[PDB]
């Protein structure tokens, strides 16, 4: 199945005998699920993201069914605002990003040009918006807060910003702030015709 990114790429997953909805997240190295009941032992762990860090319980060798496709791997359970399926599992179900096909064994990084500057960014299907690390940008902006795994961060919102992503031009909103990594969200991914295929 092929999926466009005009909407959040949600899928049905079965794990620990329970059915849930989760977000296919190319920007996530791992899989993190909201609090739930899982059998066996786990290991304390801290993961980072926008907003900061959160403590999670690490379950290894867990069987998970993502839209019918079976996979076994590590699942983190903690105070995440959204269930997300990270690359550790996306690779198991043959997930690829197309916009130029890209597998997910490595972070899907791209070169972008914005504000006359060159940078590297992460193609993030789990992000609604595009968020870049502090940088010099022309024009006016408006205060705005966005949430993430570790909480929220204050960012500067710039509209109608021209950005080139691996040669492809797009114009849209770009948020600049305390993000741990530059991420290209769905607002821009749709413009470069990005699709998820598995």
């Amino acid at each position: 199945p092929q999926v466009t990114l005009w909407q959040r790429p949600l899928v049905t997953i079965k794990i620990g005998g329970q059915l849930k909805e989760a977000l296919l997240d190319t920007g996530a190295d791992d899989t993190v699920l909201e609090e739930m009941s899982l059998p066996g032992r786990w290991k304390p762990k801290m993961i980072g993201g926008i907003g900061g860090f959160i403590k999670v319980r690490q379950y290894d060798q867990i069987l998970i069914e993502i839209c019918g496709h079976k996979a076994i791997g590590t699942v983190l359970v903690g105070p995440t605002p959204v269930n997300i399926i990270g690359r550790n599992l996306l690779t198991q179900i043959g997930m690829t990003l197309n916009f130029p096909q890209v597998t997910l064994w490595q972070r899907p990084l791209v070169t972008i040009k914005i504000g006359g500057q060159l940078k590297e960014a992460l193609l993030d299907t789990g992000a609604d918006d595009t968020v870049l690390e502090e940088m010099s940008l022309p024009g006016r902006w408006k205060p705005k807060m966005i949430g993430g795994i570790g909480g929220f961060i204050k960012v500067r919102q710039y509209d109608q910003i021209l950005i080139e992503i691996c040669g492809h031009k797009a114009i849209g909103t770009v948020l600049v702030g305390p993000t741990p990594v530059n991420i290209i969200g769905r607002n821009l991914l749709t413009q470069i015709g990005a699709t998820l295929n598995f």
């Binding site: 977000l23 997240d25 920007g27 996530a28 993201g49 926008i50 995440t80 605002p81 959204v82 997300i84 993030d124 789990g126 992000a127 609604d128 918006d129 968020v131 807060m145 966005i146 949430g147 993430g148 795994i149 929220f152 993000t179 991420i183 969200g185």
Partner: peptide
Amino acid sequence: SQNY
């Protein structure tokens, strides 16, 4: 908000 949000972005993951």
